[PDB]
Structures are given as structure tokens and as C-alpha cells.
Amino acid sequence: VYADSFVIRGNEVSQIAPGQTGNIADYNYKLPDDFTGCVIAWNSNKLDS
Amino acid sequence: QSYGFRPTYGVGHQPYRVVVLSFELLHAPATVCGPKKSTNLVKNKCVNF
Amino acid sequence: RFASVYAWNRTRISNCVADYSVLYNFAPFFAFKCYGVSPTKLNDLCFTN
Numbered sequence: 001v002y003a004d005s006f007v008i009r010g011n012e013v014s015q016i017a018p019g020q021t022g023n024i025a026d027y028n029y030k031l032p033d034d035f036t037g038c039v040i041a042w043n044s045n046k047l048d049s
Numbered sequence: 050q051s052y053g054f055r056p057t058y059g060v061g062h063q064p065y066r067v068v069v070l071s072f073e074l075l076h077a078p079a080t081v082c083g084p085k086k087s088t089n090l091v092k093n094k095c096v097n098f
Numbered sequence: 099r100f101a102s103v104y105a106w107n108r109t110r111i112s113n114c115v116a117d118y119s120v121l122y123n124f125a126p127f128f129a130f131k132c133y134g135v136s137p138t139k140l141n142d143l144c145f146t147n
């Protein structure tokens with residue numbers, strides 16, 4: 001099992017998906033189309049402000 | 050380039066700490082498993098293995 | 099002064115090279131769901147209008 005943790009903006013919280021394209025989705029982290037597993041997202045505006 | 054955050058930023062610009070779990074469930078030696086109690090092993094009898 | 103829903107503000111777009119990647123800073127973008135045209139490789143399409 002592999003876990004990867006980072007931070008992204010709200011408009012791109014759904015940008016991370018297998019085969020998505022944009023800035024992050026193709027330049028900083030992509031998920032392969034056959035990726036199995038899932039992503040976890042929550043707001044950290046209280047702390048990262 | 051700078052990726053600063055301000056608490057005055059609204060939804061879609063607040064920081065979103067994202068963690069993704071990647072699995073590799075396939076025919077390969079198992080190391081991570083759930084909390085299923087292993088029972089005694091039986092042979093030559095039809096059993097839901 | 100965005101128009102009310104009952105009288106929506108329609109705009110004509112003419113000959114132009116429109117980059118659908120610089121607009122990402124123009125709004126919070128709470129939801130960016132899209133139909134048959136995915137926004138991912140949207141900058142590689144030519145439209146009648």
C-alpha cells in the first residue's frame with residue numbers, strides 16, 4: 001500500500017484523477033488510467049492560512 | 050512560483066491537503082490485510098475459502 | 099453587473115485564440131464539471147463558434 005500526501009487548491013481538488021489534464025494533473029502528479037486505490041481530500045484553510 | 054495562501058481566500062482557493070492511497074491488489078505476496086480472524090484450515094471438504 | 103437569471107447575458111465570441119488555462123485565476127471555481135467536451139484537452143479544439 002502506498003500513500004502520497006500533499007496540498008493543492010480548491011479548484012483543483014478534483015483535478016487529480018486518472019487521465020486528467022491541466023497544470024498539476026500533467027506537470028506535478030498524474031494518476032495512471034489503470035490506477036486502483038482512492039484519494040482523500042479535506043480543507044486545511046484553518047491551519048494553512 | 051509562489052503558492053501562498055490567505056485566510057481571506059474563499060472556496061476554491063483555500064488550501065486542500067490531499068492524501069492518496071495507491072493499491073496494487075493483484076496476484077502477489079500479501080503484506081497488508083484486514084482484521085479478519087484466521088481460522089483453522091480444512092481439506093477435502095467444500096468450503097468458502 | 100452580471101445579469102439576472104430570467105434575462106441572461108449572452109455574449110458572442112468571434113475569431114480568437116482562446117486559452118482555457120489562464121481563466122483559472124479569474125474565479126473561485128467551486129464546480130468545474132463539464133459535458134461531452136472535457137476541459138482537459140479543451141485548448142486543442144477548433145469551434146465553429
Ligand SMILES: *[C@@H]1O[C@H](CO)[C@@H](O[C@@H]2O[C@H](CO)[C@@H](O)[C@H](O)[C@H]2NC(C)=O)[C@H](O)[C@H]1NC(C)=O
Nearest residue numbers: 099100101102103104105106107108109110111
Ligand atoms: C451582455 O454582454 C455583456 C456581458 O455582461 C454586457 O456588457 C457589454 O457587452 C458588450 C458586448 O455586447 C461590450 O462591448 C461592452 O464592453 C460590455 N460592457 C458594457 C459596460 O457595455 C452587455 O451589456 C450584455 N447585454 C445585455 C445585458 O443586454
